[PDB]
Write an enzyme that holds these catalytic residues in place. Sequence first.
Site, PDB file in Angstrom:
ATOM      1  NE  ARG A  62      -3.303  -1.727 -10.339  1.00 24.90           N
ATOM      2  CZ  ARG A  62      -2.242  -1.012  -9.964  1.00 24.90           C
ATOM      3  NH1 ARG A  62      -1.032  -1.454 -10.286  1.00 24.90           N
ATOM      4  NH2 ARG A  62      -2.391   0.103  -9.294  1.00 24.90           N
ATOM      5  CE1 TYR A  76     -10.285   0.149  -6.720  1.00 24.93           C
ATOM      6  CE2 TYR A  76      -9.456   1.504  -4.932  1.00 24.93           C
ATOM      7  CZ  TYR A  76      -9.319   0.418  -5.775  1.00 24.93           C
ATOM      8  OH  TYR A  76      -8.139  -0.292  -5.688  1.00 24.93           O
ATOM      9  CG  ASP A 136       0.495  -5.756   0.584  1.00 23.15           C
ATOM     10  OD1 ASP A 136       0.630  -6.803   1.240  1.00 23.15           O
ATOM     11  OD2 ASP A 136       0.927  -4.679   1.033  1.00 23.15           O
ATOM     12  CB  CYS A 191      -5.099  -2.410  -6.295  1.00 29.29           C
ATOM     13  SG  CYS A 191      -3.647  -1.286  -6.220  1.00 29.29           S
ATOM     14  CD1 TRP A 251      -9.510   4.739   1.437  1.00 27.30           C
ATOM     15  CD2 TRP A 251      -8.171   5.381  -0.236  1.00 27.30           C
ATOM     16  NE1 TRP A 251      -9.740   3.900   0.370  1.00 27.30           N
ATOM     17  CE2 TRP A 251      -8.933   4.283  -0.675  1.00 27.30           C
ATOM     18  CE3 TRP A 251      -7.249   5.957  -1.116  1.00 27.30           C
ATOM     19  CZ2 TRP A 251      -8.806   3.735  -1.950  1.00 27.30           C
ATOM     20  CZ3 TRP A 251      -7.126   5.431  -2.391  1.00 27.30           C
ATOM     21  CH2 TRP A 251      -7.888   4.315  -2.798  1.00 27.30           C
ATOM     22  CD  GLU A 272     -11.836   0.803   0.862  1.00 26.49           C
ATOM     23  OE1 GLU A 272     -12.096  -0.411   0.927  1.00 26.49           O
ATOM     24  OE2 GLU A 272     -10.705   1.158   0.418  1.00 26.49           O
TER      25      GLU A 272
HETATM   26  S1  TP2 Z   1      -2.206  -1.988  -4.960  1.00 32.07           S
HETATM   27  C1  TP2 Z   1      -2.519  -1.541  -3.223  1.00 32.07           C
HETATM   28  C2  TP2 Z   1      -2.458  -0.009  -3.187  1.00 32.07           C
HETATM   29  N1  TP2 Z   1      -3.023   0.536  -1.942  1.00 32.07           N
HETATM   30  C3  TP2 Z   1      -4.345   0.760  -1.874  1.00 32.07           C
HETATM   31  O1  TP2 Z   1      -5.138   0.834  -2.836  1.00 32.07           O
HETATM   32  C4  TP2 Z   1      -4.914   0.988  -0.451  1.00 32.07           C
HETATM   33  C5  TP2 Z   1      -5.276   2.440  -0.127  1.00 32.07           C
HETATM   34  C6  TP2 Z   1      -6.328   2.284   0.973  1.00 32.07           C
HETATM   35  C7  TP2 Z   1      -7.166   1.098   0.491  1.00 32.07           C
HETATM   36  N2  TP2 Z   1      -6.188   0.257  -0.223  1.00 32.07           N
HETATM   37  S2  TP2 Z   1      -5.999  -1.406   0.264  1.00 32.07           S
HETATM   38  O2  TP2 Z   1      -4.962  -2.092  -0.698  1.00 32.07           O
HETATM   39  O3  TP2 Z   1      -7.442  -2.056   0.204  1.00 32.07           O
HETATM   40  C8  TP2 Z   1      -5.420  -1.549   1.935  1.00 32.07           C
HETATM   41  C9  TP2 Z   1      -6.367  -1.710   2.943  1.00 32.07           C
HETATM   42  C10 TP2 Z   1      -5.892  -1.790   4.257  1.00 32.07           C
HETATM   43  C11 TP2 Z   1      -4.524  -1.711   4.524  1.00 32.07           C
HETATM   44  C12 TP2 Z   1      -4.026  -1.801   5.961  1.00 32.07           C
HETATM   45  C13 TP2 Z   1      -3.607  -1.528   3.480  1.00 32.07           C
HETATM   46  C14 TP2 Z   1      -4.054  -1.445   2.161  1.00 32.07           C
END
Ligand code: TP2
Lengths: 261, 262
Positions: free
Chosen positions: A166, A94, A169, A146, A80, A58
């Site tokens: 911002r 991004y 999780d 995020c 994604w 990524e």
């Molecule tokens: S605010 C979180 C919103 N979700 C995302 O932006 C996800 C989409 C894929 C990459 N991101 S992540 O938060 O980096 C992510 C990475 C890995 C897992 C298993 C979940 C979320």
Amino acid sequence: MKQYLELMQKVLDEGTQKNDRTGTGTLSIFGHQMRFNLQDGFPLVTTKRCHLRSIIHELLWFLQGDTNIAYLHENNVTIWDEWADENGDLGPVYGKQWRAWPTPDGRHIDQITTVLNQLKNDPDSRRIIVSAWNVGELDKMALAPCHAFFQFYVADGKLSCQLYQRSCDVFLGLPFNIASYALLVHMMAQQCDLEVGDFVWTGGDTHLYSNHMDQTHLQLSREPRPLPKLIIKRKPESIFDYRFEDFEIEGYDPHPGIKAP
Amino acid sequence: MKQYLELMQKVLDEGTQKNDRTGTGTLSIFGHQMRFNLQDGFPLVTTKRCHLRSIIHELLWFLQGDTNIAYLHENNVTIWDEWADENGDLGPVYGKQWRAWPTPDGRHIDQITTVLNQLKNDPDSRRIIVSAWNVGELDKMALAPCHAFFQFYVADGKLSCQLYQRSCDVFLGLPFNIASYALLVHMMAQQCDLEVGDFVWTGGDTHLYSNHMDQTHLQLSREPRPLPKLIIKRKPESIFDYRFEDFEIEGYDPHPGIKAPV
Ligand SMILES: *SCCNC(=O)[C@H]1CCCN1S(=O)(=O)c1ccc(C)cc1
Ligand SMILES: *SCCNC(=O)[C@H]1CCCN1S(=O)(=O)c1ccc(C)cc1
């Protein structure tokens, strides 16, 4: 990681119950900060196995400015998939903002190229920044960023970076995002002939999802292990020429991975 | 204030000696975070006399989307004068970005009106943000933004706000900027029928200028006094209709002013 485990525990003890747009609940706090001295070891959570493979693909995809998941698909990265359209497009998330932020006159701004030239020609600059928060393009994105903005800093030949996240999780996204930016710092330090400094993580809305609570309780009963060490096996011509096989993690000894819905 | 003096002390104990853009040396740290519970009192530094007058005018000006010093200069607010061109223009700095961020397709986004609506209709949103960090327009500005991005948050009927300050002049700028945002939080909360929560401050390059050192140590020899109290006298029809005279501070009893060169 000790700071990570203290953050989890803080959400548990002080988070307030909220609803999210999906109707799933959360426990959240607002405003938190952690610091990782990257000379103490690579900050990969050891209280659950974390796979670097998707993290690495990524980051490289981001640096190429690609927002279509075809490259991710070729390497079996599916994080994604649910946000992509039928053509595999995410909109200008991004990568696009990092490499080609669109200006109203039809031009584009390469923020990574700017940051590299600032590190090499003006390292004390106080504006060595990359922002993905392009207000004008948020409605076109499959998801608003995020890990929204980041800033670099140089002191005593060491490269530091601070990320403003911002929305976080804590269980699922945070370990992934810490690793991703620690990696970019190692890559940038190498391309600018600098040693690695600190990775400063600042959170805005920082939460634990309701369906991540058993997993969180499991994780907090485990003790953290010594951090691993990152090895970059080959120094490429530029920050845009890394390949997946350039990175190795050594001494990584985590507890079993924990699955979360 | 306690948090503010602790930050000054951290910059002195940990900071790295470097040189600013104009050479003017600095002591700097990278990455810091502090919190001010606005129910404890309006966070106006007390260890040196600070004038709220200029902070108010500047925020009212920002909220109008103005980027010309005329309104400031008329009200004897001279803090932006040195950056202004011969026509009093600053370029599309802070206020322009807040009120009319220009998109690629020709639209303009009013980020303050957006945040007000998101506070009234979706207070649990995780993207109630205002950014002045418009990458495409940074080089048209007289100065790139220092109080670069801010996010709101609502819990238990209270409005909080976190600011990311990418470049911080601790002695001269910071007292001003904390008061400025705490005033904004009060305005917004009043407008959304919320109570004030916390103002969270985060810094990126956080420094003390070398020619502010004796002033910093002087200030550090004083005890913080009790925080003053902010009284808003009217509830305007919108966040864009506040007036200078709507704001009153009570109980401000600071130590003497400490002058210093910018
Ligand atoms: S605010 C979180 C919103 N979700 C995302 O932006 C996800 C989409 C894929 C990459 N991101 S992540 O938060 O980096 C992510 C990475 C890995 C897992 C298993 C979940 C979320
Ligand atoms: S990174 C600081 C750069 N300088 C500024 O942006 C100045 C210009 C006028 C407003 N700001 S300020 O830092 O908020 C400020 C306010 C008051 C004084 C006395 C000095 C600086």
